[PDB]
RNA sequence: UGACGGCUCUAAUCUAUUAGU
DNA sequence: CTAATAGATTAGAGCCGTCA
């Protein structure tokens, strides 16, 4: 017979002061942080897509209910929520003719007909931003669902075009770092999902009973990206500044080999939240080895402790670098002496591997989402899914599976990891959820990780996060 | 790519030992 | 260097479900 420990809630806080464990109660309630005047919206697409997104610009003004409120709160419609104007009146239309995407996707070369869509969609914008006065805050990407099934990585149709992956999300938002244009992707049948249909008289996606969860989501991403700021973590320690590591092989560069890219977040004077990427691939040619030289690994460091430094005027006490991989002692050695002597050092390997189950017995329903199953003062099981008694259901399937949180480097108190973690899952602005599966330290880092491999070298990149998601 | 979760098919790398070079 | 047996790790792709 084990014990199980409960960890609390973290709690995030909005508008007058005030807290809640839910960000859509939060927001309906007290409202967003800081205070916007409007969103002015910039569209480029076809006829069809400008008729769409007018449509549900207009759809998402009213109060939206979803079937099951306990489940998911209402949508009491976007102003009433964010307190700014965001309408189907400061729309700047760009339109883009039904014969230029007809046929460049023709090549029957999915490098080339990529390259194209992505050169002819980026031009339009660039010119616009560059040549006119009209003021733009968000532009809104609507693309055909005829293009979306063609450009993924394996795709097959029923010169400096081979140096990107033949992604048309990844490289469209890398191409556009250089310009720092934020943007909004969406296809057509995600906001017309009533007319796109199936043999049967249906949607092939239904939205009928959780479309107020589509207008938060939508309208969460639209506030971010404008912006804005809707939620911050209540309480995050002071001097403690958490770091974020995430491995992706850069496919196809002459070679096999893999880069690094990383995310930091912090509390700065006048009680903000920093979270902001740290960009700039660092490389190592070997094919399969997932670590640092001490090279590449000195200057990480250097510059991590030099960001906060600068932002602060002191190094942070304490730093946690979490990570999905094991540390070394070659590059965890190179580690230590750039760090200063008043700063203590954490590296905690976080895993979702060891296959581990819990079943309640005589009952129907999942485990909690704070039991923590403490196995060493190095080692534990968190479930980050599982029941929430707000919500009254739990957040995934089956029977979720833990995550190991395993104190890799240095020394630390694993309840103190496990808190900090646990309230790392709660800043999910890609997102209007009750709260994540693992930290968005590990997320966001790889969202950044992701786009910054799909182009050839840009120097400096964007460090802000709407420039990425 | 509006989110998230759960599965499945695949490919490397490391460590140990053996063997033709 | 090449070719097999394992254990213990890692990163990629693709498909399905969300209510009653
Ligand atoms: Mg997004």
Request: hydrophobic residues 35%.
């Amino acid at each position: 017979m084990k014990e199980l420990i409960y960890i609390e809630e973290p709690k995030i806080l909005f508008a007058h002061g005030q807290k809640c464990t839910d960000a859509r109660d939060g927001l309906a309630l007290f409202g967003p942080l800081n205070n916007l005047y409007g969103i002015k919206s910039g569209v480029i697409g076809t006829k069809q897509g400008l008729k769409i997104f007018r449509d549900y610009l207009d759809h998402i003004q009213k109060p939206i209910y979803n079937s099951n409120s306990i489940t998911r709160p209402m949508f009491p419609g976007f102003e009433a929520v964010f307190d700014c104007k965001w309408e189907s009146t400061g729309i700047t239309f760009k339109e883009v003719t039904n014969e230029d995407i007809g046929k460049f996707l023709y090549n029957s070369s999915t490098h080339k007909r990529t390259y194209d869509l992505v050169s002819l969609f980026i031009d339009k914008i660039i010119s616009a931003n560059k040549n006119e006065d009209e003021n733009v805050d968000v532009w809104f990407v609507i693309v055909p669902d005829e293009i979306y099934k063609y450009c993924r990585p394996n795709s097959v149709l029923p010169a400096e075009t081979y140096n990107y992956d033949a992604q048309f999300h990844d490289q469209f938002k890398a191409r556009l770092l250089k310009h720092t244009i934020p943007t909004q992707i969406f296809r057509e049948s995600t906001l017309a999902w009533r007319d796109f249909k199936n043999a049967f008289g249906l949607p092939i996606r239904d939205f009928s009973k959780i479309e107020g969860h589509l207008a938060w989501t939508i309208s969460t991403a639209a506030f971010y990206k404008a912006g804005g700021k809707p939620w911050k973590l209540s309480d995050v320690r002071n001097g403690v500044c958490y770091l974020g590591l995430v491995y992706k092989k850069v496919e196809k560069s002459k070679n096999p080999r893999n880069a690094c890219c990383a995310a930091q977040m912090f509390l700065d004077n006048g009680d903000g939240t920093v979270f902001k990427g740290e960009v700039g691939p660092w490389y190592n040619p070997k094919n399969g080895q997932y670590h640092l030289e001490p090279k590449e690994a000195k200057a990480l460091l250097s510059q991590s402790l030099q960001s906060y430094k600068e932002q602060i005027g002191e190094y942070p006490k304490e730093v946690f670098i979490h990570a999905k991989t094991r540390f070394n002692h070659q590059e965890w050695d190179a580690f230590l002496e750039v760090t200063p002597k008043e700063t203590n050092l954490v590296g905690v390997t976080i895993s979702k591997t060891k296959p581990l189950k819990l079943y309640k017995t005589e009952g129907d329903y999942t485990i909690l989402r704070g039991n923590a199953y403490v196995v060493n003062e190095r080692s534990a099981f968190l479930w980050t899914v599982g029941y929430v008694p707000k919500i009254q259901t739990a957040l995934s399937m089956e029977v979720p599976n833990p995550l190991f949180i395993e104190i890799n480097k240095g020394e630390a108190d694993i309840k103190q990891v496990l808190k900090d973690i646990l309230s790392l899952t709660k800043l999910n602005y890609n997102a209007c959820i009750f709260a994540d599966g693992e930290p968005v330290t590990l997320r966001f880092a790889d969202k950044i990780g992701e786009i910054l491999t799909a182009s050839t070298d840009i120097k400096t990149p964007p460090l802000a996060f709407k420039y990425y998601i």
